[PDB]
mmCIF file of all heavy atoms in Angstrom:
data_model
loop_
_atom_site.group_PDB
_atom_site.id
_atom_site.type_symbol
_atom_site.label_atom_id
_atom_site.label_comp_id
_atom_site.label_asym_id
_atom_site.label_seq_id
_atom_site.Cartn_x
_atom_site.Cartn_y
_atom_site.Cartn_z
ATOM 1 N N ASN B 10 146.942 145.789 -142.769
ATOM 2 C CA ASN B 10 146.514 146.045 -144.149
ATOM 3 C C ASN B 10 145.292 145.280 -144.629
ATOM 4 O O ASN B 10 144.649 144.606 -143.845
ATOM 5 C CB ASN B 10 147.676 145.877 -145.119
ATOM 6 C CG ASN B 10 148.200 144.452 -145.186
ATOM 7 O OD1 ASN B 10 147.512 143.484 -144.855
ATOM 8 N ND2 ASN B 10 149.426 144.313 -145.660
ATOM 9 N N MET B 13 144.892 141.339 -144.256
ATOM 10 C CA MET B 13 144.710 140.723 -142.940
ATOM 11 C C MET B 13 146.008 140.337 -142.278
ATOM 12 O O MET B 13 146.119 139.275 -141.684
ATOM 13 C CB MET B 13 143.801 139.498 -143.041
ATOM 14 C CG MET B 13 143.001 139.231 -141.756
ATOM 15 S SD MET B 13 141.842 137.821 -141.858
ATOM 16 C CE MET B 13 143.070 136.555 -141.953
ATOM 17 N N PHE B 15 149.457 142.130 -139.941
ATOM 18 C CA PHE B 15 150.226 143.287 -139.479
ATOM 19 C C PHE B 15 151.575 143.258 -140.245
ATOM 20 O O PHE B 15 151.943 142.259 -140.820
ATOM 21 C CB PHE B 15 150.545 143.226 -137.983
ATOM 22 C CG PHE B 15 149.392 143.405 -137.074
ATOM 23 C CD1 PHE B 15 149.041 142.436 -136.159
ATOM 24 C CD2 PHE B 15 148.701 144.611 -137.052
ATOM 25 C CE1 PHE B 15 147.991 142.682 -135.223
ATOM 26 C CE2 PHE B 15 147.660 144.817 -136.174
ATOM 27 C CZ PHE B 15 147.302 143.877 -135.274
ATOM 28 N N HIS B 35 146.389 151.970 -140.965
ATOM 29 C CA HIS B 35 145.729 150.985 -141.818
ATOM 30 C C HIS B 35 145.849 151.427 -143.281
ATOM 31 O O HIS B 35 144.948 152.096 -143.780
ATOM 32 C CB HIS B 35 144.262 150.873 -141.417
ATOM 33 C CG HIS B 35 143.541 149.712 -142.026
ATOM 34 N ND1 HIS B 35 143.740 149.290 -143.325
ATOM 35 C CD2 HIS B 35 142.610 148.887 -141.501
ATOM 36 C CE1 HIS B 35 142.945 148.266 -143.577
ATOM 37 N NE2 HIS B 35 142.250 147.997 -142.485
ATOM 38 N N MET B 44 137.221 145.149 -142.651
ATOM 39 C CA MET B 44 138.621 144.776 -142.481
ATOM 40 C C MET B 44 139.248 145.678 -141.401
ATOM 41 O O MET B 44 140.310 146.258 -141.580
ATOM 42 C CB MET B 44 139.345 144.923 -143.823
ATOM 43 C CG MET B 44 140.840 144.556 -143.865
ATOM 44 S SD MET B 44 141.113 142.886 -143.365
ATOM 45 C CE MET B 44 140.423 141.908 -144.676
ATOM 46 N N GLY B 45 138.534 145.764 -140.282
ATOM 47 C CA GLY B 45 138.946 146.525 -139.116
ATOM 48 C C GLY B 45 140.110 145.873 -138.396
ATOM 49 O O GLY B 45 140.241 144.629 -138.311
ATOM 50 N N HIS B 46 141.018 146.718 -137.912
ATOM 51 C CA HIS B 46 142.093 146.231 -137.101
ATOM 52 C C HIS B 46 142.266 147.073 -135.841
ATOM 53 O O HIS B 46 142.126 148.284 -135.854
ATOM 54 C CB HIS B 46 143.404 146.274 -137.838
ATOM 55 C CG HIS B 46 143.411 145.527 -139.131
ATOM 56 N ND1 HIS B 46 142.910 144.243 -139.247
ATOM 57 C CD2 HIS B 46 143.860 145.882 -140.349
ATOM 58 C CE1 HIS B 46 143.046 143.844 -140.503
ATOM 59 N NE2 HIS B 46 143.643 144.817 -141.184
ATOM 60 N N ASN B 47 142.533 146.398 -134.756
ATOM 61 C CA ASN B 47 142.981 147.032 -133.516
ATOM 62 C C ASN B 47 144.283 146.342 -133.137
ATOM 63 O O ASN B 47 144.706 145.349 -133.805
ATOM 64 C CB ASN B 47 141.918 146.981 -132.414
ATOM 65 C CG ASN B 47 141.384 145.575 -132.146
ATOM 66 O OD1 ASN B 47 141.977 144.597 -132.582
ATOM 67 N ND2 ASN B 47 140.312 145.474 -131.363
ATOM 68 N N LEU B 86 139.550 150.153 -132.823
ATOM 69 C CA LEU B 86 139.395 149.531 -134.134
ATOM 70 C C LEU B 86 139.386 150.576 -135.219
ATOM 71 O O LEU B 86 138.611 151.541 -135.143
ATOM 72 C CB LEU B 86 138.103 148.734 -134.170
ATOM 73 C CG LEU B 86 138.035 147.767 -135.329
ATOM 74 C CD1 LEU B 86 138.830 146.500 -134.998
ATOM 75 C CD2 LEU B 86 136.596 147.495 -135.620
ATOM 76 N N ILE B 87 140.289 150.432 -136.188
ATOM 77 C CA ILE B 87 140.418 151.383 -137.302
ATOM 78 C C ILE B 87 140.245 150.733 -138.675
ATOM 79 O O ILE B 87 140.439 149.548 -138.841
ATOM 80 C CB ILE B 87 141.761 152.124 -137.250
ATOM 81 C CG1 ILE B 87 142.949 151.163 -137.439
ATOM 82 C CG2 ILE B 87 141.866 152.943 -135.935
ATOM 83 C CD1 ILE B 87 144.272 151.899 -137.705
ATOM 84 N N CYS B 112 144.822 141.307 -133.305
ATOM 85 C CA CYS B 112 143.598 142.007 -133.729
ATOM 86 C C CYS B 112 142.430 141.132 -133.349
ATOM 87 O O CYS B 112 142.488 139.893 -133.597
ATOM 88 C CB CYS B 112 143.590 142.192 -135.256
ATOM 89 S SG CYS B 112 142.056 142.946 -135.874
ATOM 90 N N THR B 113 141.419 141.710 -132.704
ATOM 91 C CA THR B 113 140.218 140.945 -132.272
ATOM 92 C C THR B 113 139.029 140.971 -133.209
ATOM 93 O O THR B 113 138.015 140.390 -132.877
ATOM 94 C CB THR B 113 139.715 141.362 -130.920
ATOM 95 O OG1 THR B 113 139.401 142.760 -130.890
ATOM 96 C CG2 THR B 113 140.747 141.127 -129.904
ATOM 97 N N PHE B 114 139.149 141.636 -134.361
ATOM 98 C CA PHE B 114 138.092 141.629 -135.369
ATOM 99 C C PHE B 114 137.827 140.156 -135.723
ATOM 100 O O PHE B 114 138.776 139.410 -135.903
ATOM 101 C CB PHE B 114 138.522 142.418 -136.597
ATOM 102 C CG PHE B 114 137.414 142.579 -137.616
ATOM 103 C CD1 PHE B 114 136.657 143.725 -137.680
ATOM 104 C CD2 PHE B 114 137.127 141.554 -138.508
ATOM 105 C CE1 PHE B 114 135.604 143.845 -138.626
ATOM 106 C CE2 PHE B 114 136.081 141.668 -139.465
ATOM 107 C CZ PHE B 114 135.318 142.796 -139.507
ATOM 108 N N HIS B 117 140.385 137.537 -137.502
ATOM 109 C CA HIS B 117 141.707 138.095 -137.793
ATOM 110 C C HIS B 117 142.846 137.529 -136.928
ATOM 111 O O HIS B 117 143.971 137.398 -137.403
ATOM 112 C CB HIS B 117 141.666 139.623 -137.656
ATOM 113 C CG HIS B 117 140.901 140.298 -138.745
ATOM 114 N ND1 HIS B 117 140.941 141.654 -138.969
ATOM 115 C CD2 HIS B 117 140.080 139.783 -139.693
ATOM 116 C CE1 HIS B 117 140.179 141.943 -140.018
ATOM 117 N NE2 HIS B 117 139.623 140.825 -140.456
ATOM 118 N N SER B 118 142.541 137.142 -135.695
ATOM 119 C CA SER B 118 143.584 136.694 -134.766
ATOM 120 C C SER B 118 144.304 135.450 -135.214
ATOM 121 O O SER B 118 145.407 135.182 -134.742
ATOM 122 C CB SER B 118 143.054 136.494 -133.358
ATOM 123 O OG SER B 118 142.147 135.453 -133.356
ATOM 124 N N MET B 121 146.698 137.579 -137.512
ATOM 125 C CA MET B 121 147.094 138.888 -136.985
ATOM 126 C C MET B 121 147.414 138.737 -135.479
ATOM 127 O O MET B 121 146.616 139.068 -134.593
ATOM 128 C CB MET B 121 146.012 139.917 -137.234
ATOM 129 C CG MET B 121 145.774 140.189 -138.709
ATOM 130 S SD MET B 121 144.751 141.610 -139.049
ATOM 131 C CE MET B 121 145.953 142.863 -138.847
HETATM 132 CU CU1 LIG E 202 141.982 143.062 -138.031
#
Side-chain angles (χ1 to χ4, degrees):
Chain B
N10 65 22
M13 209 177 69
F15 290 121
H35 192 321
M44 181 58 69
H46 304 313
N47 53 14
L86 196 80
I87 64 167
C112 176
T113 58
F114 186 98
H117 289 193
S118 66
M121 296 192 80

